[PDB]
Amino acid sequence: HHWGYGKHNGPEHWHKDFPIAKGERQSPVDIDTHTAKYDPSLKPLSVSYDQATSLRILNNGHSFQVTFDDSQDKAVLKGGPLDGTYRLLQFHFHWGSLDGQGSEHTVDKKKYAAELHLVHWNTKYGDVGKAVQQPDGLAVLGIFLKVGSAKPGLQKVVDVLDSIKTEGKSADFTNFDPRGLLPESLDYWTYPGSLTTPPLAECVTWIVLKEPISVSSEQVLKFRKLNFNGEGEPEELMVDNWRPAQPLKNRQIKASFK
Ligand SMILES: O=C(CCCCCCC(=O)Nc1ccccc1)NO
Ligand SMILES: [Zn+2]
């Protein structure tokens, strides 16, 4: 029926509605660290989040997202492999039912407990809907989460999840600073790929940071209390909302570091 992460509607079914699922630049991928090539040409990345304006937090039935005002150049990503300016629209997470799975990208086949995606769109296309129709329309910053010490900058998110438990719920989420989600190092791998949910459009320059952030067990347990269902339907925990690694095909993953 409609897509999701279950046995009957999960990633192995998506190609019937979205044939690009078997396309030439699908995401996520396994990052083989010994095959990625250091690219001395890659320009230094620029994450400019000081004027970011968060708006709302939303359970969309597949993840939860924090949305930003992207009607002006307030929070932008530039540099790295990117040409031009990419505006932050929203961030969301993918996570597991257990700490050994949950990420979408893997590193030498290792799965992390979760993966944060900070979604940005190329301002030369004017709006996100036009950007998703372009091969360089989006830039997604991917950040792995491992379980250990708490991430203080994540706590304001986790504390409001009770208020968006089920699909369709949203809440006001102003003055949230996404800089509190970033690791120390901006070393990264990059490759051309796609959205990891339907419609799987092949419009993303992926920038995946090498350094994970640590979150606590209590923080990730609160992610796993969300529901895929809407208020009143059989309760199905929102866990394992990740797509597995797809074939690399004719792509090379580049590293910003030696
Ligand atoms: O695919 C991903 C990462 C990138 C997600 C892109 C979502 C962009 C968004 O919020 N707006 C949008 C999406 C599709 C079509 C039009 C707008 N994770 O699953
Ligand atoms: Zn995502």
UniProtKB/Swiss-Prot annotation:
It is found in: Cytoplasm; Cell membrane. Its cofactor is Zn(2+); Co(2+). Activated by X-ray, histamine, L-adrenaline, L- and D-phenylalanine, L- and D-histidine, L-His-OMe and beta-Ala-His (carnosine). It catalyses: hydrogencarbonate + H(+) = CO2 + H2O; urea = cyanamide + H2O. Changing residue 140 to H: Impaired activity. Changing residue 90 to P: In OPTB3; in Czechoslovakia. Changing residue 197 to S: Enhanced p-nitrophenyl acetate esterase activity, but normal CO(2) hydrase activity. Substrate binds at residues 196-197. One of its GO terms (cellular component) is plasma membrane. Changing residue 117 to D/N/Q: Reduced activity. The active site is at 62 (proton donor/acceptor). Changing residue 5 to H: Reduced proton transfer rate. Residues 1-257 form the Alpha-carbonic anhydrase domain. Changing residue 119 to K/R: Strongly reduced CO(2) hydrase and p-nitrophenyl acetate esterase activities. Changing residue 195 to F: Normal activity. GO terms for molecular function: arylesterase activity; carbonate dehydratase activity; cyanamide hydratase activity; zinc ion binding. Changing residue 3 to A: Impaired activity, not rescued by 4-methylimidazole (4-MI). Keywords: Acetylation, Cell membrane, Cytoplasm, Disease variant, Lyase, Membrane, Metal-binding, Osteopetrosis, Phosphoprotein, Zinc. Catalyzes the reversible hydration of carbon dioxide. Can also hydrate cyanamide to urea. Stimulates the chloride-bicarbonate exchange activity of SLC26A6. Essential for bone resorption and osteoclast differentiation. Involved in the regulation of fluid secretion into the anterior chamber of the eye. Contributes to intracellular pH regulation in the duodenal upper villous epithelium during proton-coupled peptide absorption. This is Carbonic anhydrase 2. It comes from Homo sapiens (Human).
